[PDB]
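Data availability (excerpt). The following record was deposited with the supplementary files.
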Amino acid sequence: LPDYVDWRSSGAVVDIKDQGQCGSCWAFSTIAAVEGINKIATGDLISLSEQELVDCGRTQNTRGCDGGFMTDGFQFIINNGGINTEANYPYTAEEGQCNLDLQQEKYVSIDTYENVPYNNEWALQTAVAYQPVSVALEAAGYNFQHYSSGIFTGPCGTAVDHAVTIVGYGTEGGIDYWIVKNSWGTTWGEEGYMRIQRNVGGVGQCGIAKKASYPVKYYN
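Predicted structure:
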């Protein structure tokens, strides 16, 4: 595999967003992954609708601002036959009624989605070498929350309480890292991103390798 991957450098990453006062992180992670594979397969970067997932992708497990699962995000897009744009169905950071007309406007679609084999950074690296990957990690700790620069090495737990998107990886000073796109806006971390330690084994740093998945498009 390549020694360095950065999906931002090839225009497969939309500018950093902010989920605000809403636990919709699962939706931002879904969308950032979908945005990435669309660019990769079609050559066009389109910013897509998190609100649509919040409002229209409710399941038994996925509940708008009260948390959810990227797998439910991908399923909704598959089942719906696509997703509308950010501009057409803008983000409000509150759970609203599903706008059926906007739900019927489909600008980007995916064919399927896949789970990365759990607790396998090598398999995660393989997936990331090909596209951005949706992951969940433990982001509630003081240090994760106040991260502003460098490579994050903890401390953190391993409960997957917050979804983000891996948009790359590399090495600096002999330390391997993942590049993580967060949805806490540009004032957190390295203008919204975090470099977090890679190749630590097991569940990955802050449990990053526990619940990884990515959307699939058959044709390039």
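Summary of structural features: The helical segments are 25-42, 50-56, 70-80, 100-103, 121-130, 142-146.
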